[PDB]
Design a protein around this ligand. Structure first.
Ligand SMILES: *C(=O)[C@@H]([C@@H]1N=C(C(=O)O)[C@@H](S[C@@H]2CN[C@H](C(=O)N(C)C)C2)[C@@H]1C)[C@@H](C)O
Length: 265
């Protein structure tokens, strides 16, 4: 019984866990707290890259963006290496997805442009995909810091799974732009201990992680069975009971993903 297993994990990790897998052909939707709000943390960077791709000719990827010391305000493993030379939009998309680079995401928000440093256009992009739930209100680092229960900078496992499904499996993007997004997520370096850890090696996994204060740990993925049947898997968690400094616990996500993988196999 999945719901019992997920409740057990909540008790084990003193956590709140949300899980959504959209219905398919012959699988029912899997849902646990799936309509509860959880902080996006860095999972917003997947739809952000989609927004930027959609908004511009493909060769906008080649535009050089320059930035400086006062632009580095959050974990930025790539942008910190590159501050002296600048980064192209393509490099920024790569870093935002594959290293979950915060400065890259801030610069991409600015590229999208408009009110709230790009957060309003980002939210507008989600609305165009029929997501009337999610909202982005701040950039890095503030978007990870909203107190438990606060709706700012939140999505739900349900809302984000339906968004990701459109982006990767559906027709939200033209095939060329879709492939760019899928490949970046395929090559993610931050997800080995999350949804990836719950699925057997012969299943393909592409994903974007999120980690934040109050013990926040998220992962959104598309997985393909060894016969090429795709499923979207959104797992979100927090450990608000430990306060602001509560440690995120990836193991929770690995276990929840293992439970999902068992139903889908
Ligand atoms: C987004 O959630 C935030 C960043 N996203 C992270 C993630 O998805 O895991 C981490 S960065 C990632 C894990 N640690 C590695 C690292 O190189 N350092 C921590 C230095 C890579 C991060 C909280 C947001 C700040 O963009």
């Amino acid at each position: 019984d999945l719901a019992d297993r997920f409740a057990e994990l909540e008790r084990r990790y003193d956590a709140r866990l949300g899980v959504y897998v959209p219905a398919t052909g012959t699988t029912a939707a899997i849902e646990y707290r799936a309509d509860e709000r959880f902080a996006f943390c860095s999972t917003f960077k997947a739809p952000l890259v989609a927004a930027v791709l959609h908004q511009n000719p493909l060769t906008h990827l080649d535009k050089l963006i320059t930035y400086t010391s006062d632009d580095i305000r959050s974990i930025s493993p790539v942008a910190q290496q590159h501050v002296q030379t600048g980064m192209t939009i393509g490099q920024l998309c790569d870093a935002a997805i594959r290293y979950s680079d915060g400065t890259a995401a801030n610069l991409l928000l600015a590229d999208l442009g408009g009110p709230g440093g790009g957060t309003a256009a980002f939210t507008g992009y989600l609305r165009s995909l029929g997501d009337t739930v999610s909202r982005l209100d701040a950039e890095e680092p503030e978007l990870n810091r909203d107190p438990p229960g606060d709706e700012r900078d939140t999505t739900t496992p349900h809302a984000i799974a339906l968004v990701l499904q459109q982006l990767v499996l559906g027709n939200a993007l033209p095939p060329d732009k879709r492939a760019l997004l899928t490949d970046w997520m395929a090559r993610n370096t931050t997800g080995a201990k999350r949804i990836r850890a719950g699925f057997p090696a012969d299943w393909k996994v592409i994903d974007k992680t999120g980690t934040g204060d109050y013990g926040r740990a998220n992962d959104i993925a598309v997985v393909w069975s060894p016969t090429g049947v795709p499923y979207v898997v959104a797992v979100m968690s927090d450990r608000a009971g430990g306060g602001y400094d509560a440690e995120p616990r990836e193991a929770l996500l690995a276990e929840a993903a293992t439970c999902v993988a068992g139903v889908l196999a």
